[PDB]
Design a protein around this ligand. Structure first.
Ligand SMILES: O=c1[nH]c2cc(C(F)(F)F)c(N3CCOCC3)cc2n(CP(=O)(O)O)c1=O
Ligand SMILES: O=c1[nH]c2cc(C(F)(F)F)c(N3CCOCC3)cc2n(CP(=O)(O)O)c1=O
Lengths: 320, 365, 49, 50
């Protein structure tokens, strides 16, 4: 008994260990994206652009390898991966739990990242090289002057300064970026903690049995011997009776499918809208489920045989 | 890889002798502007500076102002000092200053590979509960009699009649340690399967916040002069460090800088133009990588003599090429396609396995 | 607009003499460089994720 | 001594078990070429034509 029980617990603890490893192995397998090529190599995470604009027209006309496949996907992706406005796109990313990515201008993106609730971030480098500029009527007097002015401002780092002023400084967040640093990246104390509480709980239970034990010793049971036999007999009888009640519980399983189905070993029932319930008295249940499951005969019904035997054994035991 | 001498350049002549990004960009510009051309290498081999004394322009920018050439197709930076003497088309390639570090390698046992799977916080609590049980058992069983017992319960602690009280304590404590050692084993297996080795963090701000990893730039150039004149918070501190860092954090040439990064085991970072950096990353032994975004916004352009006929045409040509994705295509051709290294391919390579001694050693000590 | 061949927005107000200069996040495109003049880029960008 | 030696062997046998699990996990990770697309997705195995 001690040997078989040992072999039993050996298998279980081995199973627990092995199983716990797959959940940790896969937990590491997870690799967030980072580049555009990552969006094409996978399909789990949907993605799209604005329904109208240079962004969408870019992929459509792009003859580049990666961007080509991306467009092919978005072109026939269902439901529509394209949004009406930029606000809708951001909202879709914030409500998809990371299942939807949105492609937009880096400038507007970087700004969004610095806005509450600070739940969005730009990943990887840009897909193409663009640039804004000061526009002046063809053949204007301000033409050359403004041109040089822009170059002068950039070299004085005044342009970079301005951007920092309205994008990062103006924030704000300014907090959601310091937490996005991506420091942590290991296991944790959480799971292990649950095992610590059950330990202290066991220690406390023992500290209670110690005092209790002492008290008992001091006291020193004979009363129970007389009324203990009667007590134990009626407890056994009560347990047996309830076991029989449990087996017949017109509810061994409920298979919701909104109707409502509940079954035991004898009846399969259904509650229709609204409230009316009907039952198909069949009595126990081996049927044509092609189960087998590879031997011959025994179940369904096998549970019937074990329950009936249990009650017969309990009756013989109660009597004796 | 803008303009290089072809393999058998000795057996070739004219424009066929050269190959590269700009060599292809030249043919494209010439096709949209409609003209024949003759690729020529600048004499002094410089870009475009202005000697303060003689007030003379040198390099390509020079050959343009003095009528030696009709157009300049090269990685010529669009600067204010040059825009005054010549004409720059719109940028055909935006760039900036980037950071270069060693190859995200990995290796180190320090019995600290055993405390990692199991967090330092967890090793602590498992020790607190350890003495927390040896003290509870100690209360189950005059001053020395308590010492001999505390040493006996500490031996009942150092792990391996029917006093129900302390009995369930030994059982629960056993179930507790069972879960932990199972967790350690499972977690360590995950580690031995994936085995991913990260690295530092991309953010010039990261170079200023720390000192363990030295860093510098070229002893002479716009890169160095950038930090010196930069009034930006982060870049300011960086310059202050490099300005008085000993030994010299500045290198003579770009090759020396790269060599310093490859021979410092990740203790030295080199700051250079993103363009040249990205290219280096695609060269054997593939032990360098660019981290974080650029520090500033620059851009190369096609230079044409002030008030030239090719002015407007070339300008539009550059814009046309970029919109057709032809520029991006060319870069991919000479940087990544023609490359030799690989990053997204090294992570796509699912293969590896072997036990060492490092981790196990920490448990021996 | 392809049909009317009319420019709209800021680029429009420039071509039709409504304004003297346009200071905004106006993208430097070939189609626009033909009708108006663009200074060097004061901010380089692109498409992101 | 018996306690520390026990903790020592505990770590080792745990390491052996974990590592051995990895040698079988990776052994399954390995996939063989099934189609042409497999030749393009990898580089370890060179290939060419006439
Ligand atoms: O010259 C142009 N400059 C633009 C500048 C910006 C912004 F980044 F917000 F400054 C944007 N947005 C990006 C995000 O979605 C909301 C608006 C659109 C622009 N468009 C329209 P396109 O035809 O879609 O490129 C232009 O034409
Ligand atoms: O017009 C210019 N074009 C340049 C183009 C390049 C390259 F990227 F290699 F094409 C470089 N390098 C970057 C890496 O270090 C080695 C040479 C320097 C350039 N410089 C000198 P700066 O004064 O330091 O900017 C110019 O003046």
């Amino acid at each position: 008994v001690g040997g078989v029980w040992w072999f039993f617990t050996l298998i279980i603890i081995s199973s627990y260990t092995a199983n716990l490893a797959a959940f940790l192995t896969v937990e590491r397998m997870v690799s967030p994206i980072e580049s555009a090529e990552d969006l094409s190599k996978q399909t789990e995470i949907a993605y799209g652009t604005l329904d109208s604009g240079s962004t969408k027209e870019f992929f459509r006309r792009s003859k580049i390898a990666v961007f080509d496949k991306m467009w092919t996907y978005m072109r026939s992706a269902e439901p529509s991966v394209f949004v009406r406005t930029t606000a809708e796109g951001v909202a879709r990313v914030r409500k998809s739990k990371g299942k939807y990515a949105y492609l937009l201008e880096s400038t507007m993106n970087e700004y969004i990242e610095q806005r509450k609730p600070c739940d969005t971030m730009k990943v990887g480098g840009n897909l193409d090289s663009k640039g804004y500029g000061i526009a002046t009527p063809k053949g204007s007097s301000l033409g050359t002057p403004v041109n040089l002015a822009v170059l002068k401002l950039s070299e004085q780092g005044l342009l970079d300064k301005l951007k920092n002023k309205w994008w990062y400084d103006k924030g704000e967040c300014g907090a959601k970026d310091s937490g996005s640093k991506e420091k942590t990246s290991a296991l944790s104390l959480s799971n292990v903690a649950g095992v610590f509480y059950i330990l202290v709980g066991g220690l406390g239970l023992a500290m209670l049995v110690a005092l209790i034990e002492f008290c008992y010793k001091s006291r020193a049971g004979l009363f129970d011997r007389g009324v203990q036999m009667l007590l134990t007999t009626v407890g056994a009888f009560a347990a047996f009776s309830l076991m029989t009640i449990a087996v017949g519980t017109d509810y061994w399983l409920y298979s919701r499918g909104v109707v409502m189905t509940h079954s035991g070993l004898w009846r399969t029932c259904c509650l229709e809208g609204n409230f009316k319930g009907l039952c198909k008295q069949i009595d126990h249940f081996p049927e044509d489920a092609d189960y087998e499951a590879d031997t011959a005969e025994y179940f369904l019904r096998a549970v019937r045989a074990s329950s009936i035997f249990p009650i017969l054994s309990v009756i013989l035991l109660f009597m004796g | 890889p803008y303009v290089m001498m072809k393999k058998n350049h000795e057996m070739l002549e004219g424009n066929e002798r050269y190959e590269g990004y700009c060599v292809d960009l030249a043919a494209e510009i010439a096709k949209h502007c409609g003209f024949k051309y003759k690729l020529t290498i600048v004499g002094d081999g410089k870009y475009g500076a202005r000697d303060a004394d003689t007030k003379i322009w040198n390099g390509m920018v020079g050959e343009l102002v003095y009528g030696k050439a009709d157009i300049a197709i090269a990685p010529l930076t669009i600067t204010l000092v040059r825009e005054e003497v010549i004409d720059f088309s719109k940028p055909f390639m935006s760039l900036g200053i980037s950071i270069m570090i060693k190859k995200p390698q990995k290796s180190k046992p320090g019995v600290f590979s055993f405390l990692d799977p199991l967090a330092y916080e967890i090793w602590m609590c498992i020790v607190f509960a350890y003495i927390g049980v040896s003290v509870v058992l100690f209360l189950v069983s005059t001053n020395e009699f308590g010492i001999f017992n505390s040493l006996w319960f500490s031996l009942g602690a150092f792990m391996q009649p029917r006093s129900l009280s302390g009995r369930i304590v030994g059982g629960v404590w056993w179930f507790f340690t069972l879960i932990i050692i199972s967790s350690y084993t499972a977690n360590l297996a995950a580690f031995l399967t994936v085995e991913r080795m990260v690295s530092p963090i991309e953010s010039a701000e990261d170079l200023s916040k720390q000192t363990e990893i030295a860093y510098g730039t070229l002893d002479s150039g716009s890169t160095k002069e950038f930090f010196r004149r930069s009034k930006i918070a982060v870049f300011d501190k960086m310059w202050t460090y490099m300005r008085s860092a000993e030994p010299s954090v500045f290198v003579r040439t770009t090759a020396e800088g790269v060599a310093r990064v490859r021979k410092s085991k990740g203790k030295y970072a080199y700051l250079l133009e993103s363009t040249m950096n990205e290219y280096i990353e695609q060269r054997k032994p593939c032990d360098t990588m660019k981290v974080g975004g650029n520090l500033d916004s620059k851009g190369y352009g096609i230079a044409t003599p002030k008030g030239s006929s090719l002015g407007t045409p070339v300008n539009l040509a550059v814009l046309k090429l970029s919109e057709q994705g032809l520029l991006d295509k060319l870069k991919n051709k000479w940087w990544y396609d023609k490359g030799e290294c690989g990053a997204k391919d090294s992570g796509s390579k699912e293969k590896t396995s072997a036990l060492s001694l490092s981790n196990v050693a920490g448990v021996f000590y």
